[PDB]
Design an enzyme around this catalytic site. Structure first.
Site, PDB file in Angstrom:
ATOM      1  N   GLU A   1      -4.941   2.671   3.032  1.00 51.48           N
ATOM      2  CA  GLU A   1      -4.640   3.684   4.032  1.00 51.48           C
ATOM      3  C   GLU A   1      -4.983   5.090   3.545  1.00 51.48           C
ATOM      4  OE1 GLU A   1      -0.414   2.818   5.095  1.00 51.48           O
ATOM      5  OE2 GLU A   1      -1.279   2.418   7.069  1.00 51.48           O
TER       6      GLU A   1
ATOM      7  N   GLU B   1      -4.474  -4.721   9.006  1.00 51.58           N
ATOM      8  CA  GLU B   1      -3.032  -4.882   8.933  1.00 51.58           C
ATOM      9  C   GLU B   1      -2.470  -4.735  10.328  1.00 51.58           C
ATOM     10  OE1 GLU B   1      -0.459  -2.847   6.194  1.00 51.58           O
ATOM     11  OE2 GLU B   1      -2.069  -2.608   4.725  1.00 51.58           O
TER      12      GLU B   1
HETATM   13  O1  LIG Z   1       5.186  -2.690   5.726  1.00 54.50           O
HETATM   14  C1  LIG Z   1       4.370  -1.671   6.286  1.00 54.50           C
HETATM   15  C2  LIG Z   1       2.946  -1.734   5.753  1.00 54.50           C
HETATM   16  O2  LIG Z   1       2.206  -0.694   6.437  1.00 54.50           O
HETATM   17  C3  LIG Z   1       0.825  -0.647   6.059  1.00 54.50           C
HETATM   18  O3  LIG Z   1       0.213   0.358   6.784  1.00 54.50           O
HETATM   19  C4  LIG Z   1       0.683  -0.377   4.556  1.00 54.50           C
HETATM   20  O4  LIG Z   1      -0.691  -0.360   4.200  1.00 54.50           O
HETATM   21  C5  LIG Z   1       1.404  -1.477   3.781  1.00 54.50           C
HETATM   22  O5  LIG Z   1       1.323  -1.218   2.385  1.00 54.50           O
HETATM   23  C6  LIG Z   1       2.868  -1.532   4.227  1.00 54.50           C
HETATM   24  O6  LIG Z   1       3.515  -0.317   3.870  1.00 54.50           O
END
Ligand SMILES: OC[C@H]1O[C@@H](O)[C@H](O)[C@@H](O)[C@H]1O
Ligand SMILES: *[C@@H]1O[C@H](CO)[C@@H](O[C@@H]2O[C@H](CO)[C@@H](O[C@@H]3O[C@H](CO[C@H]4O[C@H](CO[C@H]5O[C@H](CO)[C@@H](O)[C@H](O)[C@@H]5O[C@H]5O[C@H](CO)[C@@H](O)[C@H](O)[C@@H]5O)[C@@H](O)[C@H](O[C@H]5O[C@H](CO)[C@@H](O)[C@H](O)[C@@H]5O[C@H]5O[C@H](CO)[C@@H](O)[C@H](O)[C@@H]5O)[C@@H]4O)[C@@H](O)[C@H](O[C@@H]4O[C@H](CO)[C@@H](O)[C@H](O)[C@@H]4O)[C@@H]3O)[C@H](O)[C@H]2NC(C)=O)[C@H](O)[C@H]1NC(C)=O
Ligand SMILES: *[C@@H]1O[C@H](CO)[C@@H](O[C@@H]2O[C@H](CO)[C@@H](O[C@@H]3O[C@H](CO[C@H]4O[C@H](CO[C@H]5O[C@H](CO)[C@@H](O)[C@H](O)[C@@H]5O)[C@@H](O)[C@H](O[C@H]5O[C@H](CO)[C@@H](O)[C@H](O)[C@@H]5O)[C@@H]4O)[C@@H](O)[C@H](O[C@H]4O[C@H](CO)[C@@H](O)[C@H](O)[C@@H]4O)[C@@H]3O)[C@H](O)[C@H]2NC(C)=O)[C@H](O)[C@H]1NC(C)=O
Ligand SMILES: *[C@@H]1O[C@H](CO)[C@@H](O[C@@H]2O[C@H](CO)[C@@H](O[C@@H]3O[C@H](CO[C@H]4O[C@H](CO)[C@@H](O)[C@H](O[C@H]5O[C@H](CO)[C@@H](O)[C@H](O)[C@@H]5O)[C@@H]4O)[C@@H](O)[C@H](O)[C@@H]3O)[C@H](O)[C@H]2NC(C)=O)[C@H](O)[C@H]1NC(C)=O
Ligand SMILES: *[C@@H]1O[C@H](CO)[C@@H](O[C@@H]2O[C@H](CO)[C@@H](O[C@@H]3O[C@H](CO)[C@@H](O)[C@H](O)[C@@H]3O)[C@H](O)[C@H]2NC(C)=O)[C@H](O)[C@H]1NC(C)=O
Ligand SMILES: *[C@@H]1O[C@H](CO)[C@@H](O[C@@H]2O[C@H](CO)[C@@H](O)[C@H](O)[C@H]2NC(C)=O)[C@H](O)[C@H]1NC(C)=O
Ligand SMILES: *[C@@H]1O[C@H](CO)[C@@H](O)[C@H](O)[C@H]1NC(C)=O
Ligand SMILES: *[C@@H]1O[C@H](CO)[C@@H](O)[C@H](O)[C@H]1NC(C)=O
Ligand code: NA
Length: 971
Positions: free
Chosen positions: A160, A259
């Site tokens: 991110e 994600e």
């Molecule tokens: O659980 C929320 C997730 O959100 C994503 O955007 C992030 O890249 C992950 O590392 C985690 O934080």
């Protein structure tokens, strides 16, 4: 580019020159430290119809001692890679260095607090600090690439990389990302780089110059992370612009969601993961995941598919021990949640629908495809008049729980049709979404259209099978091009209409709990209700061997359809025996469709099973289930031994061997000192668990108060003593990461020496979500202090965290597992501690004043073999006003729980077989820290089990459990 195994075009990724819709699930190896259980997770993911798994690597666990990368034993990634290959699952590697992931430091080891450079930037000190880890992990991943015969097909640099703040203005730094990419490539990484932008901002997309990745990707969590109101779906949260943004930002690559919400994290004092599972439930999946398909997503990874546990202090203060995440596969690895079964339906649909990848996503409409504006339809049109098309339908107000009647008006190879053609109406129930198909190809046979959804389809020799399903109370219709008639070959013909319209044979039906099979030429169409479909599985059947192989056209084509229960792991043909490996949690009727021609017998979990065949060539059998007896010890009745784990509160304690907190400077570039010397634990190499500070001084008789500001992270607490006299405690809250307090002191005698002991519970290090915030550098320890009537420099300090600090003592369990309490420093939390001369007192008796005691006991287990049985340690919390005390749970040396009675919300702590020995001795240990004047004790503490699952899972091997050994230099 650098290889031909993984390629792509505007529509999708190609693996081995064959288009493949990548449906992935996120799994973190370090959150399940039991190698023999990785295969269980992969098989459960493969059974959803998925073909890939995404994983992070936690740097803080691999380089706890700066300069020494160590990934062996429970930290060895090889067994994880092996399980992936065995299960036929590809992998997306995401090594960071920064991963966030709700883990301590967001992945950064605590010593980064001493690095003179802004984290996640081109600052020289930061980049150099990452070189050792980056080189080692990239080299490890490189060997497991598909180009080397391994499962890894994609690589994610950073995490991110989407924004900055607080004084750092170098974002986006093209050379920063290029640096990470170049180093991975130099270490041997040749697969494509994929990104995961926090939002659709186009960062590092192809064509952006230095730092650009090969495939642009982004994340999305539309329902947020507050699970307090699970039935509330906020207005406007469903995204509708993903396709539009994709065409503007990265039209040359396949639309990818690296994600996508699969659950939510939960903070200390939170609502519990049961509520997160309820928010991100099966209704959330069918509406939001199908919405992603409406955009033509070609790579979709769900975070998390299996969350696991933040054992051994590996998590950040923004969360507690559990990382269940409310995901499809629970923390204890079970798959009882309805969301798992619902997800299986979508995964299997994608696995057999190649036409979806070449369809062109269009604009959503509330008037073009149905006769009512209350419904919204997004089309994915075929390239030519004969190509298959897909229509994703949902309520215009995505949160609507209303049931709506409608008629579908869509284009097909036979012209624009109004469905249902034979009469009646279609129904879309509350919070549901469906993917209607037109000109859907079933091995040469064209399904002009189907309102009911496709679960799967196969071609067995000359026979073709198509499985359709609808929700309760729905009326559906489908049509087969070129067919002349039909026959109901199973179930009543009641409610089923068949008629020729144009050159297609149209069949109408009403959903029922009773299955109906309609034969149309060489095509057998199974008509099911959603809940019956939940029990179907589509295992691949290997030509030779027992491994299913990766998912591709060939392996997909030779799969079979099995109706069963809890789980179907795999299947293979050995001679004339069809072997099926499955799990059962109740008596289960079995049905096999499409058994190979050479198959004569059915063997379930190695046992020959009596089978019968019906008219439709379906094999049927039954597996009986009888709950076995599970004998567990009564923790309160065990023989307990205990010792005072705060000897520092005695006038006889000698802290000469402790580290001197005498640095008249700090290495923390984000925080300047407010005390004579640094009292930030990381400046001295102590980054995990309980931290202790001892301030020595000679009284002058003018002392009256001691002011102090401590900091240990969200939900931390502290306790203070002056020699043997208790001064006070800060019990903590869900919103405090630090505390200011002015304590009055008892009268002191001028000329005599005193020592102030401050015990601080470290809840982990913070993440560094926004570049420039430097939140990860928030210190742990004493920030301020003032002893009235005395100069601050009058106090000389000593401090200690885990014994040895960065040169940690437990190389097997890792750098974060143990804290700085006396019993931990001595290693008493490990198997077979020296309890000969210990007191015979249990935690049910506890303490009658503030303090900390360490408890030990053991018990044997001999659970029924052949069953997968989840075990949990449960603490009671039935009082209205909660007592203030903290507990650390140790199982065979592994810390598997931090319990804070006054903050919550976790009371039930699962511990996997492998950590627990199901056929041997187990050593249980607990630290009990009373932070209230009346002391503390446990009233209810038990070891319980959930439904025993009759399994085909191989017996779990116990992990290395180093026994207690007297430690040199301990204190
Ligand atoms: O659980 C929320 C997730 O959100 C994503 O955007 C992030 O890249 C992950 O590392 C985690 O934080
Ligand atoms: C062994 O392992 C298995 C897994 O393999 C475990 O089984 C899982 O157990 C879960 C419970 O923990 C369960 O989830 C809960 O389901 C509740 C029931 O609602 C659902 O099912 C309704 C149909 O019931 C039939 O099927 C279920 C299983 O799916 C079964 O439990 C029932 O006994 C019954 O079975 C019989 O019929 C089927 C064929 O139909 C046969 O195969 C069986 O042999 C039996 O003969 C279903 O109607 C309902 O769907 C409606 O409601 C949901 C919302 O709840 C809507 O989204 C959906 O659209 C639909 O609503 C429409 O239709 C209705 C009906 O016309 C209409 O009234 C509405 O207006 C609307 O138009 C569900 O699919 C469910 O209540 C529960 O939810 C909880 O409570 C509240 C709701 O009050 C909810 O908000 C909370 O979030 C909470 O979750 C759970 O969802 C799994 O479904 C089940 N999975 C499987 C595969 O069985 C098993 O436990 C384990 N055993 C042990 C010992 O550990
Ligand atoms: C076992 O079961 C028990 C129940 O029987 C359960 O206990 C409950 O646990 C929950 C969750 O942890 C508690 O609820 C939370 O309590 C938080 C703490 O509240 C107190 O402390 C606050 C902070 O005080 C310090 O810091 C502030 C500034 O930071 C400073 O001003 C103060 O001086 C102090 O230094 C404080 O703000 C808060 O004050 C409010 O309430 C008091 C008392 O009524 C009132 O006088 C004040 O005017 C003010 O209204 C209080 O003193 C609290 O912060 C937290 O709230 C935040 O989060 C929620 C989201 O959950 C948001 O909605 C909210 O807006 C805040 O952001 C939340 O309320 C609850 O109090 C416990 N119940 C009882 C009876 O103790 C255990 O957890 C269970 N254990 C297990 C293992 O499960
Ligand atoms: C316990 O008490 C402390 C104070 O003794 C509380 O911390 C202060 O909290 C207030 C309210 O949030 C903050 O006020 C803001 O200050 C901003 C300006 O900040 C700079 O100037 C401060 C005064 O000299 C200075 O303390 C502060 O230092 C911090 O940031 C530096 C750089 O980021 C860093 O090097 C230091 O180590 C330190 O972290 C800044 O230089 C102002 O712009 C805002 O409008 C607002 O007024 C204080 O800044 C906080 N002080 C500190 C030292 O953090 C704390 O909240 C109390 N705890 C609880 C639970 O209540
Ligand atoms: C599968 O794994 C999950 C996750 O560990 C287990 O979920 C937990 O189940 C318990 C018991 O059902 C839940 O507690 C119950 O909560 C309700 C609602 O408050 C209450 O009425 C009951 O008295 C009980 O306390 C718990 O919330 C839940 N936790 C999570 C994170 O979901 C589940 O039990 C496992 N299932 C099997 C069969 O192994
Ligand atoms: C407070 O505790 C300190 C120890 O931390 C005491 O000082 C030590 O006292 C022992 C005897 O009990 C001596 O053997 C040590 O040489 C002393 N060391 C120091 C630091 O002086 C101190 O006496 C205690 N104060 C009171 C009033 O009891
Ligand atoms: C068919 O319907 C479409 C709407 O999707 C419309 O644009 C078209 O004019 C109609 N007739 C044709 C060309 O088939
Ligand atoms: C910490 O600061 C000291 C004193 O300035 C310095 O000698 C040391 O090199 C610093 N450590 C790091 C890692 O920067
Ligand atoms: Na609770």
């Amino acid at each position: 580019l650098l290889q031909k195994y993984v390629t792509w075009d505007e529509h999708s990724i190609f693996v081995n020159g064959e288009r493949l819709m990548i449906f992935s699930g996120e799994v973190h190896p370090y959150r399940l430290p039991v190698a023999s259980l990785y295969i269980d997770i992969f098989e459960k993911v493969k059974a959803l119809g998925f073909n890939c798994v995404s994983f992070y690597v936690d740097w803080a666990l691999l380089e706890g001692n700066p300069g020494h990368y160590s990934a062996e034993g429970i930290f060895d990634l090889q067994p994880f890679f092996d399980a992936a290959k065995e299960a036929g699952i590809y992998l997306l590697a995401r090594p960071g260095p920064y991963i966030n992931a709700e883990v301590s430091g967001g992945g950064f080891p605590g010593w980064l607090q001493r690095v003179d450079g802004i984290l996640r930037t081109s600052d020289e000190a930061y980049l150099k600090a990452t070189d050792n880890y980056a080189s080692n992990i990239a080299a490890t991943i490189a060997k497991a690439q598909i180009t080397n015969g391994g499962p890894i097909i994609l690589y994610q640099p950073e995490n991110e990389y989407s924004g900055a703040c607080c004084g750092y203005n170098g974002f986006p730094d093209g050379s920063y990302m290029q640096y990470i990419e170049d180093h991975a490539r130099d270490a041997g990484i040749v697969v494509p780089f994929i990104s995961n932008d926090a939002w659709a901002a186009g960062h590092n997309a192809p064509g952006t110059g230095a730092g650009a990745v090969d495939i642009y990707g982004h994340d999305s969590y539309p329902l947020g992370f507050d699970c307090a109101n699970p039935s509330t779906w906020p207005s406007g949260n469903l995204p509708t612009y993903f396709h539009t943004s994709h065409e503007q930002q990265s039209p040359s690559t396949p639309y990818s969601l690296v994600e996508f919400q699969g659950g939510a994290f939960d903070p200390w004092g939170g609502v519990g993961f049961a509520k997160c599972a309820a928010l991100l439930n099966h209704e959330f999946e069918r509406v939001f995941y199908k919405n992603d398909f409406s955009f033509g997503v070609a790579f979709l990874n769900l975070y998390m598919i299996f969350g696991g546990t933040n054992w051994g202090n590996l998590g950040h203060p923004g969360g507690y021990t559990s990382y269940d995440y409310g995901s499809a596969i629970s923390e204890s690895r079970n798959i009882t949640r309805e969301k798992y079964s619902e997800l299986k339906l979508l995964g299997n649909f994608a696995k057999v629908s190649p036409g979806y990848l070449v369809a062109n996503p269009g604009d959503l409409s509330t008037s073009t495809y149905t006769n009512t504006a209350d419904l919204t339809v997004t089309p994915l049109l075929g390239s030519n008049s004969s190509a298959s098309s897909f229509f994703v339908i949902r309520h215009s107000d995505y949160s609507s729980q209303a049931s709506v009647e409608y008629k579908l008006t869509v284009p097909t190879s036979a012209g624009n049709l109004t469905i249902p053609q034979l009469g009646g109406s279609l129904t879309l129930s509350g919070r549901d979404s469906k993917i209607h198909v037109t000109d859907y190809d079933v091995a040469g046979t064209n399904i002009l259209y189907s309102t009911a959804e496709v679960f799967t389809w196969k071609k067995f020799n000359n026979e073709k099978v198509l499985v359709l399903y609808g929700g309760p109370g729905e009326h559906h219709e489908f049509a087969v091009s070129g067919a002349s008639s039909s026959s109901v070959v199973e179930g009543s013909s009641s409610g089923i209409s068949s008629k020729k319209v144009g050159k297609a044979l149209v069949v109408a039906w009403d959903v029922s709990t009773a299955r109906r099979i309609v034969q149309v030429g060489s095509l057998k169409v199974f008509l099911l209700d959603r809940n019956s479909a939940y029990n179907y599985w589509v295992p691949q059947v290997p030509t030779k061997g027992t491994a299913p192989g990766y998912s591709n056209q060939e392996t997909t084509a030779s799969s079979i359809i099995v109706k069963a229960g809890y789980l179907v792991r795999s299947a293979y043909l050995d001679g004339n025996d069809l072997h099926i490996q499955a799990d059962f949690n109740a008596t289960t009727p079995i049905e096999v469709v499409g058994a190979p021609s050479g198959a004569k017998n059915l063997v379930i979990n190695g046992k020959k099973t009596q089978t019968k065949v019906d008219k439709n060539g379906i094999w049927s059998a039954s597996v009986a289930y009888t709950a076995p007896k599970v004998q567990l010890p009564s923790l309160k009745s065990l023989k307990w031994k205990s010792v005072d784990t705060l000897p520092e509160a005695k006038n006889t304690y000698d802290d000469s061997a402790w580290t001197s907190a005498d640095h008249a400077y700090t290495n923390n570039s984000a925080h300047s000192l407010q005390t004579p010397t640094s009292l930030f634990a990381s400046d001295y190499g102590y980054h995990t668990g309980a931290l202790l500070f001892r301030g020595h001084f000679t009284a002058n008789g003018k002392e009256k108060t001691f002011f102090v500001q401590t900091k240990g992270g969200t939900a931390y607490g502290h306790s203070i003593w002056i020699n043997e006299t208790y001064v006070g405690s800060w019990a903590g809250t869900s919103i405090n990461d630090n505390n200011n307090a002015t304590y009055t002191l008892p009268t002191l005698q001028s000329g005599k020496n005193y020592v102030i002991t401050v015990v601080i519970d470290n809840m982990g290090l913070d993440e560094d979500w926004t570049i420039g915030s430097e939140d990860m550098k928030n210190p742990r320890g004493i920030i301020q202090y003032s002893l009235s009537g005395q100069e601050a420099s009058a106090i000389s300090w000593k401090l200690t965290g885990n014994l040895g600090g960065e040169n940690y003592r437990d190389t097997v369990r890792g750098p974060l597992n143990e804290g700085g309490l006396y019993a931990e420093r001595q290693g008493f939390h490990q198997p077979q501690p020296p309890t000969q001369k210990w007191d015979s007192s249990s935690p049910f008796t506890g303490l009658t004043k503030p303090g900390i005691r360490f408890y030990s006991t053991s018990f044997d287990l001999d659970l029924p073999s052949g069953y997968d049985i989840p075990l949990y340690f449960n603490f009671g919390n039935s009082t209205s006003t909660p007592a203030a005390y903290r507990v650390q749970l140790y199982v065979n040396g592994y810390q598997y729980g931090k319990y804070v009675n006054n903050i919550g919300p976790q009371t039930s702590f699962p511990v996997p077989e492998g950590i627990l020995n199901y056929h041997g001795t187990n050593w249980l240990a607990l630290s009990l820290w009373a932070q209230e004047d009346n002391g503390a004790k446990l009233d209810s503490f038990e070891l319980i089990n959930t439904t025993p699952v009759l399994t085909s899972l191989g017996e779990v091997k116990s992990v290395n459990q180093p026994k207690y050994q007297a430690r040199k230099g301990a204190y």
